[PDB]
Amino acid sequence: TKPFTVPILTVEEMSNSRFPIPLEKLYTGPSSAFVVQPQNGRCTTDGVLLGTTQLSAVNICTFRGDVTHIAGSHDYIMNLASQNWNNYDPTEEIPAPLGTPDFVGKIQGMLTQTTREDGSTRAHKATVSTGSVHFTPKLGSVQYTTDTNNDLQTGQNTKFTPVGVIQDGNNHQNEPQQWVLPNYSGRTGHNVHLAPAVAPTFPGEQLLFFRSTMPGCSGYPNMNLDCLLPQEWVQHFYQEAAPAQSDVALLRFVNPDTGRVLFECKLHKSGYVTVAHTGPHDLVIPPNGYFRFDSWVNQFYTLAPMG
C-alpha cells in the first residue's frame, strides 16, 4: 500500500496554515472552553482539503478584486475575484473563497493596485474587520477602512496583502478571537460547508497546536495563532494522498542529531494532533527536531505521557 509519511521539516522551517507567517513553537492546553473549528489548515491525512483550505502559504488571508470608494469616508468595498483574478463563483460548495481568514479580528495590511492603461501603481494601508457586518466573503465582497479617500481607482485589479492584527479599547488582548469563526455571508445567512469542530476525545489528551505570533500593528492584540496542521503538511498529504490504514497515525518527534525521540503524539486521519498531557504548556524542543510517522494504531491506543 502507498506508505504514509509526514514531511521531515522542523517546526521553524514550516509555515502557519492560518496566516502567512512561519511557525514558531508547539503548544498544548485544554480546549473544552472553546469551539475549535478553524477552516484554514484543514485536510485529511488522505489528502482531502477541507473548509476554506488551499495550498499556497502566501495566499492565506489575502484578497484580490476591484474596489469602489464609499463617499464621505476613507473606506472601500472590494468586489472579490478568485486568487487568479478570475470571477469568484459563490456557487461552489465551500464556506467562502479559499484562504479567507477564519477568525474574528482586525487584520491590517496594504491594498496595492495597478492601472492597466499606463502601469502606474499605488499602495495604501488598510484594515479589514472580519467581525463587521460588511465582511461578506461568501457573497463576494469585503470592506476596508483606509488612510485615503481619493487615490484608489475603480475597475482596476487591487490586492490586499495581510501584515498583522490590531486591537482597540481597554481590556487588552480582548481581540482578535482566533477560535470564533466570522460570518462569511454576513447576516444574509449562516455559514455553510464548514470543516467540523475538533476536540480531544481520548481521556487525558489535549490538542497539539502549531503556534505562531501574528505581528501586532496597533493596540494590545492577542497575537497567538494556533493551527491544527503546518501548511506543508497540508501540501504533503494532498500530493501523497496515502490511504489511512487506521483512524490514528502514531508520530514520534525525533531529534535528527541525537537520533532520540522526545515524545509521541496522535495524528488523527481527520487532520489534527493530540498528546497525552493535562494543562497549558509551551513545548521546549531541539531546533532540529521533526515529526516522523512510525505506525498506524487503534483509536484506543494510550500515548506515553508527553515530555
Ligand X SMILES: C[C@@H]1O[C@@H](O[C@@H]2[C@@H](O[C@H]3O[C@H](CO)[C@H](O)[C@H](O)[C@H]3O)[C@@H](O)[C@@H](CO)O[C@H]2O)[C@@H](O)[C@H](O)[C@@H]1O
Binding site for ligand X (CB under 6 A): 120-122, 124, 148, 151, 218-219
Q: Which is nearer to a copy of itself, 55 or 261 (CB)?
A: 55
Contacts of residue 50, defined as CB under 8 A and 6 or more positions apart, other chains included, come to 39, 42, 43, 44, 195, 271
Can you list the positions of beta strands (E) in 255-289? 261-268, 272-276, 281-282
Place of cell 490511504: 243
Contact of residue 14 among a copy of itself, ligand X, none (CB under 5-8 Å per partner type):
a copy of itself
Q: State the nearest-atom distance from the C-beta of 87 to a copy of itself, in Å.
A: 13
246-266 b/e with 16+ CB inside 10 Å = b? eebbbbbbbbeeeeeebbbbb
Cell 492560518 belongs to 18
What distance in Å separates the CA atoms of residue 97 and residue 139, rounded to the nearest whole number? 9
Q: Which residues bind a copy of itself (CB under 8 A)?
A: 7-9, 12-15, 20-22, 24, 55-59, 83-84, 108-110, 112, 114, 118-123, 125, 159, 161, 163-164, 166-167, 172-173, 215-221, 223, 232, 235, 239, 287
Nearer to ligand X, 66 or 226 (CB): 66
Select from a copy of itself, ligand X, none the partner in contact with residue 151, using the beta carbon and a kind-dependent cut-off of 5 to 8 Å: ligand X
| Bridge pairing between strands 106-114 and 261-268 | unpaired
CA distance 28 to 280: 6
Report how far residue 64's alpha carbon sits from residue 54's, in angstroms, rounded to the nearest whole number.
15
Q: With respect to a copy of itself, which residue has the nearer C-beta, 125 or 193?
A: 125
Toward ligand X, which CB reaches closer, 115 or 258? 115
> Least distance to a copy of itself from the beta carbon of 297, Å?
25
Of the pair 120, 173, the CB lying nearest ligand X is at 120
Q: Of a copy of itself, ligand X, none, which one does residue 58 interact with (CB within 5 to 8 Å by kind)?
A: a copy of itself
Sign for the pseudo-dihedral over CA of 254, 236, 194, 225? positive
| Minimum distance, C-beta of residue 186 to a copy of itself, in the bound complex (Å) | 27
